[PDB]
Amino acid sequence: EDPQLLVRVRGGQLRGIRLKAPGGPVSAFLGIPFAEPPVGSRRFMPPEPKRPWSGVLDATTFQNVCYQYVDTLYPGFEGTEMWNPNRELSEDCLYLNVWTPYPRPASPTPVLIWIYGGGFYSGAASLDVYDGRFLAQVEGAVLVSMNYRVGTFGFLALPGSREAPGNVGLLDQRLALQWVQENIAAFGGDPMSVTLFGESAGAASVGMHILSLPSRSLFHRAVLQSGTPNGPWATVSAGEARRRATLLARLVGCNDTELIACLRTRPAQDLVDHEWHVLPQESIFRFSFVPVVDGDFLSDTPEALINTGDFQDLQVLVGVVKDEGSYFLVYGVPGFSKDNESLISRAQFLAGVRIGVPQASDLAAEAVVLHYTDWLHPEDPTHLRDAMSAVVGDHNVVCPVAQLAGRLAAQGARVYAYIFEHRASTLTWPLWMGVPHGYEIEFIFGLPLDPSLNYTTEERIFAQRLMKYWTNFARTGDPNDPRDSKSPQWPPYTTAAQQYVSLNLKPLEVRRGLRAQTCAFWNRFLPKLLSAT
Amino acid sequence: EGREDPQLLVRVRGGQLRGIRLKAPGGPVSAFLGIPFAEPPVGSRRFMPPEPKRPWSGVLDATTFQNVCYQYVDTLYPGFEGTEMWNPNRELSEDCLYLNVWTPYPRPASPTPVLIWIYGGGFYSGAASLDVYDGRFLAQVEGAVLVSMNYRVGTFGFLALPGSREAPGNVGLLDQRLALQWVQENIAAFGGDPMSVTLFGESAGAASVGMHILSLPSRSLFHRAVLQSGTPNGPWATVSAGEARRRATLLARLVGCNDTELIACLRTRPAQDLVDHEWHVLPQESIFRFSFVPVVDGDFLSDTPEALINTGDFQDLQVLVGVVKDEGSYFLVYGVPGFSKDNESLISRAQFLAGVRIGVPQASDLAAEAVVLHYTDWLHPEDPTHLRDAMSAVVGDHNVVCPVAQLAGRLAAQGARVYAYIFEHRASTLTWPLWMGVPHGYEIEFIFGLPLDPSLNYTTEERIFAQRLMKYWTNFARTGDPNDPRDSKSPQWPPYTTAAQQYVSLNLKPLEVRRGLRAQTCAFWNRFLPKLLSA
Numbered sequence A: 001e002d003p004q005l006l007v008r009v010r011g012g013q014l015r016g017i018r019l020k021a022p023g024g025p026v027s028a029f030l031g032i033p034f035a036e037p038p039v040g041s042r043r044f045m046p047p048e049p050k051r052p053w054s055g056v057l058d059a060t061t062f063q064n065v066c067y068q069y070v071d072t073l074y075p076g077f078e079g080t081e082m083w084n085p086n087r088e089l090s091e092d093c094l095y096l097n098v099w100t101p102y103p104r105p106a107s108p109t110p111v112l113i114w115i116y117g118g119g120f121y122s123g124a125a126s127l128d129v130y131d132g133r134f135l136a137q138v139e140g141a142v143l144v145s146m147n148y149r150v151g152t153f154g155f156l157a158l159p160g161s162r163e164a165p166g167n168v169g170l171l172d173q174r175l176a177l178q179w180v181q182e183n184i185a186a187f188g189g190d191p192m193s194v195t196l197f198g199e200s201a202g203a204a205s206v207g208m209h210i211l212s213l214p215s216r217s218l219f220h221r222a223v224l225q226s227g228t229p230n231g232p233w234a235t236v237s238a239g240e241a242r243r244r245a246t247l248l249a250r251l252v253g254c255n256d257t258e259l260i261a262c263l264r265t266r267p268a269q270d271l272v273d274h275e276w277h278v279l280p281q282e283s284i285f286r287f288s289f290v291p292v293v294d295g296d297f298l299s300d301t302p303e304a305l306i307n308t309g310d311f312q313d314l315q316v317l318v319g320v321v322k323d324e325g326s327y328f329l330v331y332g333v334p335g336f337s338k339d340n341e342s343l344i345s346r347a348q349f350l351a352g353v354r355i356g357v358p359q360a361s362d363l364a365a366e367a368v369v370l371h372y373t374d375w376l377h378p379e380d381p382t383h384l385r386d387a388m389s390a391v392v393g394d395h396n397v398v399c400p401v402a403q404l405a406g407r408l409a410a411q412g413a414r415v416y417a418y419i420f421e422h423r424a425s426t427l428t429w430p431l432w433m434g435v436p437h438g439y440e441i442e443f444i445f446g447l448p449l450d451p452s453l454n455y456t457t458e459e460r461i462f463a464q465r466l467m468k469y470w471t472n473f474a475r476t477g478d479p480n481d482p483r484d485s486k487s488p489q490w491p492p493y494t495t496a497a498q499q500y501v502s503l504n505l506k507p508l509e510v511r512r513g514l515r516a517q518t519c520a521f522w523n524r525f526l527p528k529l530l531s532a533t
Numbered sequence B: 001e002g003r004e005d006p007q008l009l010v011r012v013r014g015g016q017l018r019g020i021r022l023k024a025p026g027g028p029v030s031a032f033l034g035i036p037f038a039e040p041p042v043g044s045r046r047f048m049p050p051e052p053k054r055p056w057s058g059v060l061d062a063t064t065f066q067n068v069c070y071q072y073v074d075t076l077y078p079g080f081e082g083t084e085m086w087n088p089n090r091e092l093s094e095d096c097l098y099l100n101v102w103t104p105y106p107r108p109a110s111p112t113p114v115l116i117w118i119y120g121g122g123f124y125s126g127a128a129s130l131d132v133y134d135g136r137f138l139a140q141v142e143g144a145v146l147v148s149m150n151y152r153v154g155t156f157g158f159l160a161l162p163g164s165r166e167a168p169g170n171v172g173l174l175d176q177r178l179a180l181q182w183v184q185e186n187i188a189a190f191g192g193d194p195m196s197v198t199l200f201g202e203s204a205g206a207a208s209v210g211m212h213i214l215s216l217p218s219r220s221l222f223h224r225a226v227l228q229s230g231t232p233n234g235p236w237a238t239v240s241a242g243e244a245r246r247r248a249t250l251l252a253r254l255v256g257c258n259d260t261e262l263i264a265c266l267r268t269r270p271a272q273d274l275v276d277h278e279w280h281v282l283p284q285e286s287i288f289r290f291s292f293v294p295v296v297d298g299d300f301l302s303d304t305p306e307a308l309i310n311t312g313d314f315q316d317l318q319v320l321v322g323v324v325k326d327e328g329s330y331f332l333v334y335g336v337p338g339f340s341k342d343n344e345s346l347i348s349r350a351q352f353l354a355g356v357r358i359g360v361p362q363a364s365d366l367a368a369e370a371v372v373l374h375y376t377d378w379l380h381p382e383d384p385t386h387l388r389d390a391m392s393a394v395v396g397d398h399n400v401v402c403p404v405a406q407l408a409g410r411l412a413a414q415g416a417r418v419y420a421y422i423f424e425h426r427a428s429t430l431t432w433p434l435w436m437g438v439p440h441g442y443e444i445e446f447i448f449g450l451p452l453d454p455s456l457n458y459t460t461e462e463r464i465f466a467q468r469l470m471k472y473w474t475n476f477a478r479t480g481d482p483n484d485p486r487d488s489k490s491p492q493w494p495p496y497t498t499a500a501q502q503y504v505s506l507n508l509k510p511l512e513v514r515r516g517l518r519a520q521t522c523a524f525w526n527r528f529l530p531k532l533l534s535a
């Protein structure tokens, strides 16, 4: 019985496990319950605090993955499988994970809380790319990650109902944040220094905690990687939520109360089976059950809230990868495949645009095409392909990020911005996809430090740089190394200079304007164009 | 005759002419100035198509420029050389339909390829007697036969009650055509080759050239065309029949005037009275818009220029087209608040938005926002210098560069051989401020070889540059190809094509080839904008 592995939290006693990181041991506490299992009558309901337990709870292994769709597009393919559930699926899934240095930190240590992505329909804190041992070992970080309900289980909403209020997945995350507040000190973590970081849907989730009053007291800093609360995919109106919920109910044979009761009787996989069929249009980068503007968790739309928010007390790190859009193209755009070079025709490009910008009117889609066309080579299939990617990436991540950055900086927040441009030597996707959505994560989490992974040593050095930025940000709200003079320095993003940095094997380079001209098209003109249909 | 210079007596269809021996820097040229090609379009003939000049008795003296067609005179910067060079340099009169011929001296032995100049001036001004249109240099140095005609401008040349007999419209264009026919009948008498006629013009002159291309009855009158900073298509060169009718009736009202009766009243008004009111009939506050221009009459122009260039066949045709670096700057000082020739014209974002409404007068609010959004530098949205240069570009792109790009494209795609250029040399002698760069109209003096005149103060490099340009122009007149047949040691000028969209830079440095004429931005003006307005 290793005293270093025994912790007492408010709920009782836990036993962690000692894991080996390339440079030493870490204490891991996996599968810690933070809520009553949201099963049965609890389905679709706000989470409830875990009841206390007797004896010593085994916290040495990952718990179940929240019930979710499993990707089938390229069965057995490492590129897609790495995101799939690596534990048994279950609605009983509200557990979190904690890594600390071994032994337990001598003093209160800054906490990082990871919130995974997956379009709000998938994901798990137990994935390898979210392995927290490296950050704990090398940086001395206390690292927390929670499972939260996805798909219908987490976000199906009949706005105004008592039995399906919506946003319960976000409430899962918030409850976990509270748990950290009440318990993290027992692990040597500092409740007064908590940094949320997340990617994609996880980034959007972080964004929503920023925009929700009750979450404010639960964290001090935020990192949003490749995702925002604002933008086309992260939220839906009460009306659209109600619409999708009713439709899904109809699709499985089911007055709110009676409708939700009937839904509570269906095997989990029935709901998952019809989940994806409620989308209003043929689209990509669009998800069926996501946070809903309920006037509760979100008092108004994200755009409204970031436009009028006061972000004085806040530091934020935001950024994107070089090719945000590529990944999504193979999941709906004719002409695109991970197997060929996906060279496309102008006709396919126009077709692609209606799918990538599913809300676009004809004139808006034409506006897009004309903007993204290279009029020197309007038919070159290589640019047409890369343009299709750019359209999707810009529309969904880059410009929503540029907007958020601007609004936050303009309204009191300390903001740092990056673009991530290194393509993993070990990437299994085709070259034409470049640096795809999600492939900075393995570097931030420090995986290349594991020799058995076969990254280059430049990459191992690169990962070390990134873990430094992230953890320095967590410690101080400033990613800059306090010992390193000459680098150059990572400047804050401001509406004036609009500076951000490139993250790659070369040293920090400062650039100005985050796709400034094109995002202006998306952020300023496009809305006017659609408001006049 | 008898004691006169035997080399200066020539007969044309209308009678005998006595020309004059002029001194060019490298020797004498023959000039025949103020030759009548039509009956004076005066009195009951005002607004009417031109009638051929009735033959005269004796020897018509052709030693001086004739009247300038009645027109408005610019008054923005009184006395300033930058504006005065364009102003009338002979008496204003409705009796103004005369043309000029320069030829080598003595005249050419074999048939010589002919260049016909058509001046610009927004269809409300201009004259073939201006110093910058002096044909002595092209005649002397290139041995060219050069012809320029006066044509009626403003109301006298373009007021139309479409469908009427007494004011059919486009008569200014008919003046031009009549002169082209005169060249066909008579130019051989000077040693000119009627079977090798090349039209060239700038601004409204270029658009005029463009319209002869688009008008069937003109087909047989020329073989090749140069369009400098102007096009038949675009926002300013034509008006609908409806808009012309609207403008004519409004002008009539402003001077106290059934088509027949209205026109009859207009014919009793002093010419000056029409000039004093012509500028008042424009639909909006604007720049680069002119009250009385060619109308789409379903006759001279069987359809809109846009339609005609889209569906036309242009095989047996070579065309040279191009623009200057700063097409728009000149126009800013004539109506965009914040702009002047006397300061740097650094403007605020607000003045930029206001300028866009003026420079794009037909734009709805959304289309204007589109323009502003496109031209804004979102790294420096409030920067006065960028906004000033952006305002120039908006005007330049909308009115010249993109209509030209549009035209070159259609022409090329449809049989024409097209060469394209951008002219980037700012004259050492320019009197406008540096911020205006290379303004609309300021390549002309080089094409005509004025820098060869020692007393003009051009640099030696400018002299040499002018010689190159005269070569390009005359080579194209001769062969439909600006390239020198011999000198292949000098860089070549590729034709413009839809595929490669190549054009050359014209400056003190040797020809340099470039690709795409504001392709990205012109896609906005040519493809997107139309669709945004119709919605």
Ligand SMILES: NC(=O)c1cc[n+](CCC[n+]2ccc(/C=N/O)cc2)cc1
Pocket (backbone or CB within 6 Å): A069, A071, A083, A119, A121, A275, A276, A286, A287, A288, A289, A327, A328, A331, A437, A438, A439
């Ligand atoms: N039910 C849904 O909303 C739903 C919508 C769309 N899809 C297709 C997901 C296709 N996809 C998988 C992974 C990624 C990103 N990886 O980093 C991007 C896209 C699956 C489910």
Ligand SMILES: NC(=O)c1cc[n+](CCC[n+]2ccc(/C=N/O)cc2)cc1
Pocket (backbone or CB within 6 Å): B072, B074, B086, B122, B124, B278, B279, B280, B288, B289, B290, B291, B292, B330, B331, B334, B440, B441, B442
């Ligand atoms: N009546 C009219 O149409 C009319 C319209 C506009 N203006 C002002 C013209 C002001 N302007 C003069 C010369 C040039 C180009 N020079 O190369 C550019 C602009 C005068 C008359």
Ligand SMILES: *[C@@H]1O[C@H](CO)[C@@H](O)[C@H](O)[C@H]1NC(C)=O
Pocket (backbone or CB within 6 Å): B337, B338, B339, B340, B342, B343, B344, B345, B346
């Ligand atoms: C330049 O002159 C114009 C015309 O008077 C004026 O509108 C503008 O404000 C001036 N620009 C300055 C003073 O910077």
Ligand SMILES: *[C@@H]1O[C@H](CO)[C@@H](O)[C@H](O)[C@H]1NC(C)=O
Pocket (backbone or CB within 6 Å): B455, B456, B457
């Ligand atoms: C050329 O320069 C000389 C010397 O300054 C001057 O006297 C003359 O007036 C100038 N000529 C012209 C036409 O500008």
Ligand SMILES: [Br-]
Pocket (backbone or CB within 6 Å): A283, A284, A285, A286, A328, A331
């Ligand atoms: Br998707």
Ligand SMILES: [Br-]
Pocket (backbone or CB within 6 Å): B286, B287, B288, B289, B331, B334
């Ligand atoms: Br004007």
